[PDB]
Symmetry: D3
Subunit: 274 residues, 6 copies
């Protein structure tokens, strides 16, 4: 009838797994600049945790990943439909917490940044389904919304409840959020490749396909993955060998270095201001 | 990337299919603009529900035409449904009333609990009772009607404030009637092992019927039933006396719906 | 037609390494019942054939690729041929009971095989439909499935036994029933401690009963049902859910109680006979201690 | 203190330089808590006649120092001391070995009582003694006494195990209980044997005197295999000359053992006390053997009584009968009922036929992957495969309850033989169906005489047995009729299923097509496609029909029916 | 134990099937202008028939077509591997057939034309497997080589075998053959579409995908075709409705009319510089 | 445009590591036949291209995901593109045989290719239908399938060979057939000692012939035929059956007997020259 045990089951499962906690560390780091009450910071951390959990729950069915952190995924314990149902309700649940922050403007930020996140994820899903390689500009504009969406969403809701005074620090913090969202995705791509199964594009894999327009081997191992469903170890070694010859990994290291210089410059400028 | 063509695609496709407009016809002296706003909210919520339900039932067709997940994929349809929820959120905001927000959130919570119970019963093959099944369809199906009626009463010019309870009861009875009718007009005209009022009566009145339970189990681990198996299921339901046990419910619900 | 293709699946399973629990049980009971070597060997053949047919059928109805580490009979001869050989083995055993020179041995056979088939039918119904039985229902079933061959052999031995030893029948039947319960709870314990076919057990029943709201265990069991077996990480999660409800200790308590009953019954039998039975107690030692 | 605490046991005090010219100044110890060792043999003896039977041999017991297991090895732990005396007495009496059947059951109760107590305390510690026990018993069995052997050097290593040294050795191992590595044993095996041989050779040497009398008593005895008696034929002498011969021969190689203790393990690595203590333990028993064997009754029996006198102080049936009633509710044709004596006997036979046919149909539907039967869903789609198999087996068991009420023992054998033939036929059918093997015409016709004519033969023979005595000369005629009738039914079924083989079943027309045309590759390819994919699509079926009709196989089939029909 | 019975086998089942005789009729067509003897005509016709049979046998495998002319395909009676083997041997058989024409240049012609045919087929396969939409120019270039290759082969060998005199009328005949193959392919596409199961790109489909690079529905249905290895009736009707809105069935009739104008002009021109 | 899709699979299979048995055999024959270097390189090109096409096709017709520890060609380019490239390779070699400046070099090519295709056809038919050939039938097949390239190369070399080389035609051809037979038996031995594609071999044919009633072996072979391959315990069971039947010793004796003929033929050829 009404027990609400089949709704929060999947939500509670994913919320009891090991996690890095980068989203909460970002809030803690920002709270130094914007002095805020512990109550508000904890509310924002809960919001970020719920949004992250919903995103993780959804992005596992769309990747057919049986395991998460060595533990089984949520849809392998509850079912795909139940996981979708709980994830679509976590959006409503967060909607009641943004409304408890006592600010009419906080709902506008929520409703705009969520739309940006959904646009980015929609583009990622399209490029995954239809194997169309995007340009570097396109890929860098997706991950500034798909991954930098949560950081920007948290930042804009925190400079609004920030006590008076500091209001000028809006553009700088937003740029920091975007650069961090870019860095945290290039880093994950580099880590995953140097140390693709679901035929997912990455920054190193676009450079290879762009610099080498006549590489017919790469474009065929990229299609065997789509057709069969995944690449075995012998084919993954071939893909890594093809990427090692185009200088894609060096390109990725250069991009990461360039991004980190921007991060440190923004941090030093912000520290100078405050 | 500032495009909306891969996010709004499935939403436009599901809104182009032919419909019956039950929710719109359901929709207190209200100004016309408010009525159009409420109709848009109802339509968008129904479209999202259909988009999600077609996936959770592996239905290749909807009203004769293809389903949304066979033209755009599963994941894109899911993303579009989530953004449709966000868009309904935006639409409720424009109604210019603080108290519509709480109504929307509470009704969505109830609708999701009902759908969760339905999904649990369908996946695990656990047969609900009469009371549990009749309480699940007061939320999964009557949730939209209750949501709309509570929203309409609030933004209606004063006077009509004591009729919230009566209209809510009317909405619950209406949702029950719709679900029981759709159960009836599906056997007196299953492949995903969906329970129903006739099926529950048959399985409860007969605690030792092994044939029906075996056919249902075959349906579960086959992806669906063929024509002979569906025919024997119908014969079992007809012999158990559940086609007119359901016809008594449809009359009893019509008695309540007529009174209030 | 020259035989073969019929007693080939039967001979493949008779050439595999075994243990000899039933044979040792017969030799342990013979010191109390006292039978000629001919009759004891005939009963050994009957028990061996019946156990082999049971294993042949169990492998098919469990989708088990291997048995004792070696390939199964139906992966070398086909499902249909194995079924045919198993059906013929029942007719073959029914030819050996007739050579025991007793009309009353046929009634015992035909009345205990019915109980065997009833217990196995309930096992199959619960496995296929996903229904979870109660502890009483589960314990009663394994008193007919696993403790039926022991009872069958026992009731045949107390009928060919020379005149006098015939009042010791109810005690021996109870001993066989408790042995059949013990041999199944032990396997249930051993498999878990060190579900691919959605098989129920004492720990799993306890976990499902004590926790009416554990939605994760009921979820992984359904995943197993809908995927033809669990993976190793899901198996570890199922096993971990069974150490938080106390199922592993509940199974050991049941095992201890069963062993106490076995020891009490053996002591009573060794007292109402006058002969200490040092071969059945070595079998008890080989089991747990 | 993890060393040998020899405070509970002490050496024997004797002023002589050495008794009987053996074991000069060796530690022949005696245990002060020896009272447990005494009953150990007596408790065993009480078990024997209670399980095996009466004894007339007294055994091993002397008024002097003590038992052979007492003097030789008193270095046991206080608790694990009497369990060994139980083993020794059985071994010291086993060499000599309806009521015969009862005697055997007694043996299984002695070879398990000793095993129980020994294994109970510690199995890995225990397993050593049984492992040595297994090979020890077997070795002496193989050596035939009628066949002789060669020089004493090759003799001793047979004898060192034949009477058996490692037996006492493995109990000493059982005394202190250190597990030893596998390969390190091998290099020290030639270290222990010189001690073992000298240890073992004494036993027989003292025991020679009593072994002699036995040969004269037994005529059939071929040889008294014994080391010292081997000198009697090899080096012919009076008698006591051979007793002198080895009196110091063993004495000569034990002196070697003192070196081995002080050698490399305890030499260069003198500060390696964990290993150096291990070596010493082995050489303690040696003085023990000569003590007891000196004058004991077992070896010198003159004491007899003097030794004895001095020493006297579920409701069920719903998941079983679920697939069976479903298949019995589907429409039938009444072919076997019409084929089938007072009315009750006829009804009993009709019930038997119906149940057997239902079981056959249930089993056959599973092995055809056929979802439908008479337009109605098959049984394995309402109850599954395993439940249907269970019900099919129980139906075979149940028919037996029906057969036994016909009041005829010679109806219990007809049923079994006919079912054997039915299963043979079905086995050949299944083998040909699976392993893509086309039978010949004769093989196919033989198979369908048993798979399909088995039921008719069974019913006819049962009816002849049941029927009044006068009309019993038919039998053969009716059986031949039934065989032809079943053949006709099978050929008809093959013919009709073609005019108007989704599982690649060999029919009568198909065999003709395959045999008359050895070079037809299209038909064979289509059959293999059916085997692999699972079945045939409609144009494939039409091309199969075209290939069969071109070869004139349907006209062949119709000729068989007219031939079969004429015989009927 | 030396019979050639499992090799020639698949090559006879495909020959037994009914045909339309386009290649034979074409061979008869250029024979009035070239006037070469009957035995040479029969040899050329046998070469063309064998090449067409090999092409059909390979094509049916590379598309999973259970049926051909209403009857089952060759790889459902002999399997895939034996069909591939027979297709590979039919090339060698055709090349034994060519040397009997008693002209060294026939071998060079044959080798060049088969190189072109294999290039065209390679591009067709790459576009089909990788889900890459060709442009109009690329598609028209491919169908000029894959489909017009056989006609060009036959006409180039015919103008070489034929009795002396007339030799300058080679380029015109090659142009005619290329245009004719283009027409055959476009006609086949139109007939199939009006009256992509294996994700095959056509002229109307290319036009629709080029005209509206925002139609996500068409692209999604084309991807569903690839994912499920085929399209059902409602999805095919939806694709046809999409093509009947972007003016793809009308942009195809103009191409066919232009190809007929070219064919008629080429025939007329090749009727003036002869007798 | 270009041939980037037609020569893809050919170049990929050329890149992979090889042994060089064909090139070594050509070099070995050269000491008797004394061809110029240019012709020897032309023949090496022909042999390499033919071998590569053969491997490309064999991997397809045997569902082998791997080749020498590296991914197969049809796992990178698809089955259709690989078949197309193999056919173009068959075409391309015929443009190389035509560059040897001898009309008679083409009839040899056509006849030996016919023989090779016949042998492979019998192999494929036996594999698909699950029919066990006889020893004579099996040995006649491999004398054409794997003894075909050797015979082709030998005949072309003797045809190009500068004058003389009269009697060195039949002896060298017999050497080629024996050598191909020995290579196939050696490969069968190696595969066995250190079945997934239901492939018959000398040990397996011997076992199924010496034992007319071994039902277990036939059942395991049918299970391999149906399921798609043998998992490890079933492969161990087949190996145990073969060891019990004595097939391994039969194979080793056959290998020794073939090597004796190889040695005698080589000694005789050296003796004549």
């Amino acid at each position: 009838i009404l027990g609400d045990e089949h709704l929060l089951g999947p939500a509670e499962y994913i919320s009891s797994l090991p996690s890095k906690g980068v989203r909460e560390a970002f809030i803690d780091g920002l709270n130094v600049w914007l002095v805020l009450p512990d109550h508000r910071v904890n509310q924002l951390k809960s919001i970020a945790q719920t949004l992250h959990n919903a995103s993780l729950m959804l992005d596992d069915i769309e990747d057919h990943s049986p395991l998460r952190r060595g533990r089984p995924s949520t849809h392998m314990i509850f079912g795909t439909e139940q996981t979708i149902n709980s994830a679509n309700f976590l959006l409503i649940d967060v909607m009641e917490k943004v409304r408890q922050l006592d600010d009419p403007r906080c709902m506008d930020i929520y409703l705009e940044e969520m739309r940006n996140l959904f646009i980015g994820q929609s583009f990622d899903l399209y490029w995954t389904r239809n194997g169309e390689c995007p340009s570097e500009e396109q890929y860098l504009d997706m991950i500034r919304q798909k991954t930098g969406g949560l950081f920007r969403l948290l930042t804009r809701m925190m400079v609004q409840i920030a006590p008076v005074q500091q209001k000028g620090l809006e553009t700088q913090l937003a740029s920091l959020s975007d650069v961090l969202g870019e860095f945290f995705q290039v880093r994950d791509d580099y880590k995953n490749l140097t140390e693709l199964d679901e035929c997912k594009f990455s920054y190193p894999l676009i450079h290879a396909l762009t610099s080498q327009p006549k590489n017919v081997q790469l474009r065929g191992i990229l299609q065997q993955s789509r057709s069969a469903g995944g690449l075995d170890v012998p084919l993954k070694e071939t893909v890594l060998s093809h990427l090692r010859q185009a200088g894609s990994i060096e390109y990725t290291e250069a991009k990461m270095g360039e991004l980190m210089e921007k991060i440190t410059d923004s941090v030093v400028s912000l520290e100078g201001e405050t």
